[PDB]
């Protein structure tokens, strides 16, 4: 839902607090992606 996936283009145009509206999204969808690789590897490991 946010504007860019390389970080500085945001840091260069917004403050310290609409930062907490526009960096957290990327952090969340990233955390979710890590949570999928780790659970999918944790299920995958039980096949192995």
């Amino acid at each position: 839902g946010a504007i860019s996936s390389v970080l500085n283009d945001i840091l260069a145009r917004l403050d310290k607090v609409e930062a907490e509206v526009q960096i957290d999204r990327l952090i969340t969808g990233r955390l979710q992606s890590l949570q999928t690789y780790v659970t999918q590897q944790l299920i995958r490991a039980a096949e192995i």
Binding site: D15, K16, V17, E20
Partner: protein, 48 residues
């Protein structure tokens, strides 16, 4: 109840009273009197 009350006081033109808000950027909030992005506090103001 609060661990302390600290009260900060000054007089400013109305075009800048908005800068008396959390994490605000700009001249008066940047170099005159300053609030963090977490300011666990209030602003009380009137035309004087």
């Amino acid at each position: 109840c609060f661990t302390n009350v600290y009260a900060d006081s000054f007089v400013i033109r109305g075009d800048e009273v908005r800068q008396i808000a959390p994490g605000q950027t700009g001249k008066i909030a940047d170099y005159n009197y300053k609030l963090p992005d977490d300011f666990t506090g209030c602003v009380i103001a009137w035309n004087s």
